[PDB]
Amino acid sequence: SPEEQLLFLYIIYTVGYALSFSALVIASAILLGFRHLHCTRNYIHLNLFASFILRALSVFIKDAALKWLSYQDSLACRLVFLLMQYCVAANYYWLLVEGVYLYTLLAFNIFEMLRIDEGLRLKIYKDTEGYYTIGIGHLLTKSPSLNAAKSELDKAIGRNTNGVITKDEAEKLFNQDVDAAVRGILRNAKLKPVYDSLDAVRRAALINMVFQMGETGVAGFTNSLRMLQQKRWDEAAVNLAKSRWYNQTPNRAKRVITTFRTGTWDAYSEQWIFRLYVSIGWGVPLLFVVPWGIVKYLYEDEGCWTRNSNMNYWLIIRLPILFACIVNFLIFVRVICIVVSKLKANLMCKTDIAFRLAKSTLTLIPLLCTHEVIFAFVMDRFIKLFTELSFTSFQGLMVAILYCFVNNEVQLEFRKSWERWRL
Ligand SMILES: CC1(C)CC([C@@H](Nc2ccc(-n3cnc(C(F)(F)F)c3)nc2)c2ccc(C(=O)NCCC(=O)O)cc2)C1
Q1: With a 6 A CB cut-off, is 109 part of the ligand 1 pocket?
Q2: Are 344 and 350 in contact (CB under 8 A)?
Q3: CA angle 195, 196, 201 (to 5 degrees)
Q4: Which residues make Cβ contacts (< 8 Å) with residue 90, sequence separation at least 6?
Q5: Which one from 63, 73, 127, 302 is the annotated catalytic residue?
């Protein structure tokens, strides 16, 4: 039947958005309620969820307005459609920042953490404690003799130093120190079990302290290292503040304790970038959705602007989206070589967060952007393409599923608090 087909697809679409909405609100509720989940990654997700929830709201509003001059002629419809188009470009751009965040998350490592903490020197300097340092955090000897420090550096660099050392030579010695730091952990009976129980990020947190103090020194934190292995992050955090290390160099300590406490790079994460992401996810939409809304109100106003087929004015919401998809696929491309390397190199297990996120993210990029890309310059078997409307509807649900319900972290939060109820 013709009428029966058109009605059944409508059912699946609305229950798609009903289930989507419900699930995404529950998920955002979870990310917001549990304190441990308060990190930049999940904040980006909450923005993404918002874009999907708001899209859902538009769907439900349009539907309620069917209930009693017609609705297609009204201006309130054209407004709800502009809100929905904004959400759609917000979906695709919070996905672009979801892609960018993932890329940089793969690009930040210990080498970028220690370049931030330790600084860079070109010439040899006599530090406060008495050690001559140069390069990135490379202490030479405490022996109070600049002549002998320059020589001690010359054997450690090969050619004659003179005092000034080039950027490439410093990066070479920096690599040397970091290999030495990880070997020092693994050659340490108290640091290896905890290091092998830590995830890559908290691993880099441990490496950092070794780079500053040394293997035999951070081993001293017996009180803290035990509760780090027992996965009790917050109880160790307050314990590491009560340290000599925290009172000696506190700005460095706070960053590293936060990295133990959270498991993210957020304490090495400039506060202005999260801005520029909330700006690109929500802002740049506003940079091509509203001038569309104008040419559509001015030059193409016909039945809530659905009869969108005349002239260039279709392109200017499809090209910016098209452009995001292109990159999101370039990103999609580059990322995978990244992950193949990092898993081949054993640099990145499958238990880690950068990988878990590429699982999610790299799924959604094509599942969202692929259709966009195929029919790249098409403007417009009929019961077949109807099924695209079932995918989009459930899109919202899928995100929640992928970005909260199957996410390991939140499941640990649930079990942890039921246990707090029993005890
Ligand atoms: C509808 C589906 C069947 C498709 C979806 C599926 N997508 C997906 C799965 C795997 C790869 N993949 C593997 N290797 C590479 C490579 F090449 F190395 F990069 C990529 N790519 C894409 C998926 C399944 C499982 C998860 C998952 O457990 N999430 C929890 C992780 C977390 O959030 O904490 C996520 C996504 C689910």
Answers
A1: no
A2: no
A3: 60
A4: 50, 51, 54, 281, 282, 285
A5: 127
Other CB atoms within a 10 A radius of the CB of residue 318 amount to 16
Do residues 227 and 236 lie in contact, with contact meaning Cβ atoms separated by under 8 Å?
yes
What's at 387, amino acid-wise? Answer: T
Secondary structure percentages of the chain, helix, strand, coil, to 5: 75, 5, 25
Q: Which two tokens stand for residue 78?
A: 């054209």
Please name which of 119, 84, 115, 102 lies closest in space to residue 44, comparing C-alpha atoms. Answer: 102
What are the tokens at 35? 């304190």
Q: Is the CB of 360 under 6 A from ligand 1?
A: yes
**Is residue 363 lining ligand 1, measured as CB closer than 6 Å?**
yes
Centroid of ligand 1 to alpha carbon of 326 (angstroms)? 21
Q: Which of 335, 355, 363 to mutate to test the pocket of ligand 1 (most atoms within 8 A of CB)?
A: 363
200: Cβ below 6 Å to ligand 1?
no
Residue type, 8: F
Cα distance between the two ends of the chain: 59
Q: In degrees to the nearest 10, what's the CA dihedral of 250, 251, 256, 259?
A: 130
Locate tokens 């202005």: which residue?
Answer: 272
Strand segments, DSSP code E, in 2-139 are 121-126, 132-135, 138-139
Q: How many CA atoms lie within 13 A of 218 on its CB side?
A: 25
Tokens for 49? 């969820």
Q: Which of 5, 43, 36, 22 is nearest to 277 (CA)?
A: 43
**Does the annotation flag 239 for ligand binding?**
yes
Residue 139: strand pairing partners:
133
Neighbours of 305 (CB within 10 A): 20
Q: Cβ distance 353 to 37 under 8 Å?
A: no
What CA–CA distance (Å, rounded) separates 136 from 171? 8
Choice from 359, 364, 395 to test ligand 1 binding pocket (greatest atom count within 8 A of CB): 359
Q: Which backbone phi and psi does 134 adopt, to 5 degrees? A: -170, 160
Determine the distance separating the centroid of ligand 1 and the alpha carbon of 359, expressed in angstroms: 4
Partners of 126 in the β-ladder: 132
- Resolution value in angstroms: 3.1
